């Protein structure tokens, strides 16, 4: 439903972060806590936080 | 509720905390905005820190 794509690479700064490559796609699970969103990577299935200025809607 | 500094920061005001990259913090108050009141676990000093300079431990 709510799909986003990474515009840049990101290396996790903490265990609860998701690392990802540019072009990776995400399902957003929770965006209500701030500018870091909980998401599910559609390439790896891993869940974690991502910075919402590193992505754009698909 | 523990955070670590990703960068060095020199205080811009007395109520700010100065800190070095790697310093650890207990957050005392994060409800007032993007500057959080913190306690340095290295010095015991309390003050405000920019919450984009840190990551959770």
């Amino acid at each position: 439903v709510t799909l986003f794509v990474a515009l840049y690479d990101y290396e996790a700064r903490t265990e609860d972060d998701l690392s990802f490559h540019k072009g990776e796609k995400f399902q957003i699970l929770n965006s209500s806590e701030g500018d870091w969103w909980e998401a599910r990577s559609l390439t790896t299935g891993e869940t974690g936080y991502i910075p919402s200025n590193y992505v754009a809607p698909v | 509720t523990l955070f670590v500094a990703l960068y060095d920061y020199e205080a811009r005001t007395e109520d700010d905390l100065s800190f070095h990259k790697g310093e650890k913090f207990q957050i005392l108050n994060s409800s007032e905005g993007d500057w959080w009141e913190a306690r340095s676990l290295t010095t015991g000093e309390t003050g405000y820190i920019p919450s984009n300079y840190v990551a959770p431990v």
Binding site: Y8, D9, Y10, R13, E33, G34, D35, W36, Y49, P51, S52, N53, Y54 | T1, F3, I27, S30, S31, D34, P50, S51, N52, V54, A55, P56
Partner: peptide, 10 residues
């Protein structure tokens, strides 16, 4: 790579 945004409240 843009600057990271402020962390979420604990």
């Amino acid at each position: 790579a843009p600057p990271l945004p402020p962390r979420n409240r604990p």
